[PDB]
Amino acid sequence: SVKGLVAVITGGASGLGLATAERLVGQGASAVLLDLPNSGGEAQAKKLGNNCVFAPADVTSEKDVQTALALAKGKFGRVDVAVNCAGIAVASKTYNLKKGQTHTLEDFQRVLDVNLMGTFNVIRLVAGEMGQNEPDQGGQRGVIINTASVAAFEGQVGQAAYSASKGGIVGMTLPIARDLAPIGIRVMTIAPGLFGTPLLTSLPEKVRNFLASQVPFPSRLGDPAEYAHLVQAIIENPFLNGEVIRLDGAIRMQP
Amino acid sequence: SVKGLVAVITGGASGLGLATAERLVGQGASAVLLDLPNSGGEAQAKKLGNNCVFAPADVTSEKDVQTALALAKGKFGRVDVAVNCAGIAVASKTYNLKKGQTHTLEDFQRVLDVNLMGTFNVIRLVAGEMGQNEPDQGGQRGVIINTASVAAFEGQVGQAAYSASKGGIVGMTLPIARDLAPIGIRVMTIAPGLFGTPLLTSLPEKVRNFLASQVPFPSRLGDPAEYAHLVQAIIENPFLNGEVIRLDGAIRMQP
Amino acid sequence: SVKGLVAVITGGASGLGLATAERLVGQGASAVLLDLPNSGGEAQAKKLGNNCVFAPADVTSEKDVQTALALAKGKFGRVDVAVNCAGIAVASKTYNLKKGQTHTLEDFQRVLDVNLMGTFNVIRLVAGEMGQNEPDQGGQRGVIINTASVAAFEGQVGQAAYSASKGGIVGMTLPIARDLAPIGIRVMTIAPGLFGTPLLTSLPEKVRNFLASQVPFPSRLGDPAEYAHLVQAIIENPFLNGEVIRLDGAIRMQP
Amino acid sequence: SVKGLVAVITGGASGLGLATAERLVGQGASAVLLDLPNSGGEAQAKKLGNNCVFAPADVTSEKDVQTALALAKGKFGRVDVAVNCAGIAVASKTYNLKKGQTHTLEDFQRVLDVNLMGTFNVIRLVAGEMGQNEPDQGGQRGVIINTASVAAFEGQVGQAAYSASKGGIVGMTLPIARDLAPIGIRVMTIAPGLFGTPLLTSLPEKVRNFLASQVPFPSRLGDPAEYAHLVQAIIENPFLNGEVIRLDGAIRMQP
Ligand SMILES: NC(=O)C1=CN([C@@H]2O[C@H](COP(=O)([O-])OP(=O)([O-])OC[C@H]3O[C@@H](n4cnc5c(N)ncnc54)[C@H]([O-])[C@@H]3[O-])[C@@H](O)[C@H]2O)C=C[C@@H]1n1cc2c(=S)n([C@H](C(=O)N3CCCCCC3)c3ccccc3)cnc2n1
Ligand SMILES: NC(=O)C1=CN([C@@H]2O[C@H](COP(=O)([O-])OP(=O)([O-])OC[C@H]3O[C@@H](n4cnc5c(N)ncnc54)[C@H]([O-])[C@@H]3[O-])[C@@H](O)[C@H]2O)C=C[C@@H]1n1cc2c(=S)n([C@H](C(=O)N3CCCCCC3)c3ccccc3)cnc2n1
Ligand SMILES: NC(=O)C1=CN([C@@H]2O[C@H](COP(=O)([O-])OP(=O)([O-])OC[C@H]3O[C@@H](n4cnc5c(N)ncnc54)[C@H]([O-])[C@@H]3[O-])[C@@H](O)[C@H]2O)C=C[C@@H]1n1cc2c(=S)n([C@H](C(=O)N3CCCCCC3)c3ccccc3)cnc2n1
Numbered sequence A, B, C, D: 001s002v003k004g005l006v007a008v009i010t011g012g013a014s015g016l017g018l019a020t021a022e023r024l025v026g027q028g029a030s031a032v033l034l035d036l037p038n039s040g041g042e043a044q045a046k047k048l049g050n051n052c053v054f055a056p057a058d059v060t061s062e063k064d065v066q067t068a069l070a071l072a073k074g075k076f077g078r079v080d081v082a083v084n085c086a087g088i089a090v091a092s093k094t095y096n097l098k099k100g101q102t103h104t105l106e107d108f109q110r111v112l113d114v115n116l117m118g119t120f121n122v123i124r125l126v127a128g129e130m131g132q133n134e135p136d137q138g139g140q141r142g143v144i145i146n147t148a149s150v151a152a153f154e155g156q157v158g159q160a161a162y163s164a165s166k167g168g169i170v171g172m173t174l175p176i177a178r179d180l181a182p183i184g185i186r187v188m189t190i191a192p193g194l195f196g197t198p199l200l201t202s203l204p205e206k207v208r209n210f211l212a213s214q215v216p217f218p219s220r221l222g223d224p225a226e227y228a229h230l231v232q233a234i235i236e237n238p239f240l241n242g243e244v245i246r247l248d249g250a251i252r253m254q255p
């Protein structure tokens, strides 16, 4: 049971991170919403109750994550679980001949920084915090869960930067599990397909709906609560480690 | 919730299948233990109560599986879930030059027959049973879960036939999910690493210690109840489909 | 160079196997076309010249493959390369509610037997033949190259049996390579996407053209000589072992 | 044949990149060695003759890459092939309880920037130069070949940053292929295992020999010429696209 656990959730003010916070808190765990100052994390934490607090932070900054982790320790005593949900998307072709347009370097760099470097920043710092926990009866001190994407495996036209960042997450999952194995911290990754969150609000309704119609079964966007459910499953199951799990209705993305 | 669901579980007399039955019955589901007549399936079904019965069957035989499925309908009225745990193992090198010895054809055929064909036989016949169910609120008529193995991905020396059979289960996981998507039957696969079923627990203690010593974290054989927990998670999560999940404590098998 | 090498090519009377034989014989190697009696191997062996012969054989049969290998030794002195191209296709849904149709067991079995068991039968027997070769300066005694398919990874609707058989080939690639590594026999697998061979002729022209239109680049079916080129590249490169190579114009198959 | 093609080879002053240049120039191609100013690339270009020149540049830099590509256009008129070999390595645990030590953020950022962003930097700019070529008979305008690592798949203890960078390479291979498919530019990636290059010089001789000893077959480090051979095979085969190829003697890395 997740009752009593302390979880730090990046991107916790919105979409999949928020849904995760809701479910876990609803089960008696405590949540720390690590999100940008501009988000509505403060209001979300206020709605989720006394077992939920907001820690304003940018995941690409060492100092910010240190501050939020210190806050989490200070309020809830320890960190049992970390969920990397902070992330951003861009659509931009590598090169467009007809338009004579080139993907910009900084668009590639900014996506890499938040999604990949930002996730690793939280991982390396939170691992030091989980290192201080006494191992439970099973030898465990903590659980770390990251968010990749099926774009790591079937990136679509326009998805080079996103794919690189999420492929980086997939690739570093096993080595980081190996690193932390002697101190009993599990490391797992979820690769969502298409989910109904504000991430997708930026696209034409005909665009979303089309995408939606491609999921083999069930034929719809995933529900953020379904992501949350898989997070809990992973937290609960002591033998799940070093793996990436597709959560995507069996879709395979076309160009 | 799996309360009230009806599950047909092959290899239900022992190890992973048995663990799955115990947990699902313990959670309010009904279970049919599908296994060979000479096994202890009857006793395990008796032990598990009125919501559990034993159906003798060889999964390589169409008639037997038809017989078992007819028994399940007659006893519990419908089938909501199928879990393929029935399997065998062999250790035999492709060729041994020092011994002058060749893997026998029928050793290869037998393992294929039980592990791969047998699983497909249950899937195709149980899909036809599930197609008679009225779709639930989610439009779902059924969930089928197969058992592969990490040997699908890192088959060891001696494991050519087993690896072949488990790779086949992995390979057909998506197309079967695609096939049955229009009727709302999700198809998922679990790839166990090293688990404490009679297959391993009946080995010499030094060997058990050695095998456990290979799992990065936690450094022990998997508990069959952990497989069962994962079966339940997949049953409960409506968006898991067409995927293979490694359940293995982050091990990667060496030759 | 492949110059002077002896290759036994199963499925050599047609399509990819035939083109492999054409290229290799063209590159100074000798080829044995291993294929069924009713195939046109005899005529194809005559067309290719003195350095190519036909060995009639069914790859699911121990004695036949034994007879064909003995033919190959007696005629060309040794065996240095084996390429498994013998294979069959079927299109059949696991279950079709609207049509009231269930995949037959014997369609699943026949596909397994020829494609998967047949390939392992050739592998296990030819390995013992290569093990009698004295290793070259690089320690190598033989190269074995198998044919899987992208259906091992993206099985389409109707391809469950095919995908099972090819996923099998993929899964046993590494263990067999591990098995034979002490005696210097490399094991590699090619996964072709879509190629213009007599295999696809049964299909309606419209489907063939539609499939062709979906290969991203180059936008066409693969030419069998392109497969042949990859086989030579694998033969020639000493460090390629235990791997599966997609040859498919970047396509990813949809349902 | 590669005779007459113009290839831009990053990391061309050393190891795999150098060996690639050696082989292609030897086969009649022209090469531009793109490498750092303090590398001995000039000396290597001078040694390779009229058909090889050096372009001093840091792949993390837009201006430097623009300069080296313009240098290429001016010396050989066009660019037909790009090979990304530029790369660095670091060994550093995510978190080390024993030493109470944490992976630095900048160690992670540096490896990403050189290995992953730098590779994307070259690809996006060179795609612009190949776009200018009239398509050949097969509609092809160019070939892009990247260097990942088996660390993308089995990152070792200490390899998190490196694994992240090469996993990124693997991830973006398909989307970039799909991006450039309508203009006829193929994108391919090689994942080398262990190769005898200066990359490995800074390791203790013991680690090196132990690493070499775990290659199943052939049991040695890979020869840089063997990388070069594979590059050539990919350039030559028109139907290889959107794929990653392991070149590693069938090794699988342990923690
Ligand atoms: N939803 C999905 O379907 C999927 C999500 N994910 C990931 O899940 C995590 C949570 O995201 P979220 O909750 O959905 O978004 P959110 O914005 O509501 O919340 C994120 C939070 O992070 C917080 N945050 C942010 N930065 C920081 C920071 N620095 N520090 C701390 N906190 C930070 C932020 O404030 C916010 O609260 C992130 O890692 C996502 O990348 C992966 C696969 C799926 N997934 C589907 C995706 C699609 S369809 N695209 C398309 C696409 O690729 N197209 C081209 C090809 C064809 C498809 C159509 C377009 C797209 C969509 C919109 C815009 C551009 C591009 C992209 N990525 C996708 N991911
Ligand atoms: N061509 C391709 O695109 C592909 C081929 N391959 C494989 O390559 C090998 C050689 O095949 P071939 O040379 O193309 O055929 P061939 O008939 O010319 O040569 C075979 C030889 O083997 C010999 N032989 C045979 N048996 C033996 C034996 N016992 N012993 C000894 N020798 C034997 C036989 O006599 C003959 O000489 C085989 O192992 C194939 O499986 C894999 C990927 C591709 N590949 C593409 C494929 C497609 S599109 N399908 C579709 C499909 O799946 N559909 C569903 C999804 C939507 C798309 C439309 C249909 C299909 C096609 C035809 C009928 C049903 C279904 C199937 N398989 C495919 N494989
Ligand atoms: N060799 C191999 O086995 C492998 C190589 N590769 C890649 O192949 C490409 C060519 O590299 P190279 O020719 O081998 O090196 P090089 O130095 O001779 O040439 C690189 C050139 O790029 C140039 N260059 C550079 N930067 C730039 C730039 N900015 N702009 C422009 N040009 C640049 C540079 O000047 C130089 O000329 C690079 O992209 C490599 O990353 C992948 C898998 C293999 N591969 C094996 C690897 C191993 S065993 N490690 C271990 C490890 O991970 N350990 C932990 C786990 C346990 C095992 C023991 C240690 C390691 C080794 C050394 C130091 C630290 C760590 C790392 N990476 C590996 N990659």
Ligand SMILES: NC(=O)c1ccc[n+]([C@@H]2O[C@H](COP(=O)([O-])OP(=O)(O)OC[C@H]3O[C@@H](n4cnc5c(N)ncnc54)[C@H](O)[C@@H]3O)[C@@H](O)[C@H]2O)c1
Pocket (backbone or CB within 6 Å): B010, B011, B012, B013, B014, B015, B016, B017, B018, B034, B035, B036, B039, B057, B058, B059, B060, B084, B085, B086, B087, B088, B089, B114, B118, B147, B148, B149, B150, B191, B192, B193, B194, B195, B196, B197, B198, B199, B200
């Ligand atoms: N335990 C591990 O280390 C491990 C690792 C990977 C995969 N697996 C797989 O997990 C699944 C369950 O294994 P287990 O550990 O529970 O093994 P087990 O031997 O404890 O149980 C196997 C069950 O399958 C039954 N069975 C065998 N042939 C049958 C047939 N022809 N028809 C019907 N029933 C048949 C056996 O009688 C037995 O009850 C198998 O597919 C196995 O290959 C196990």
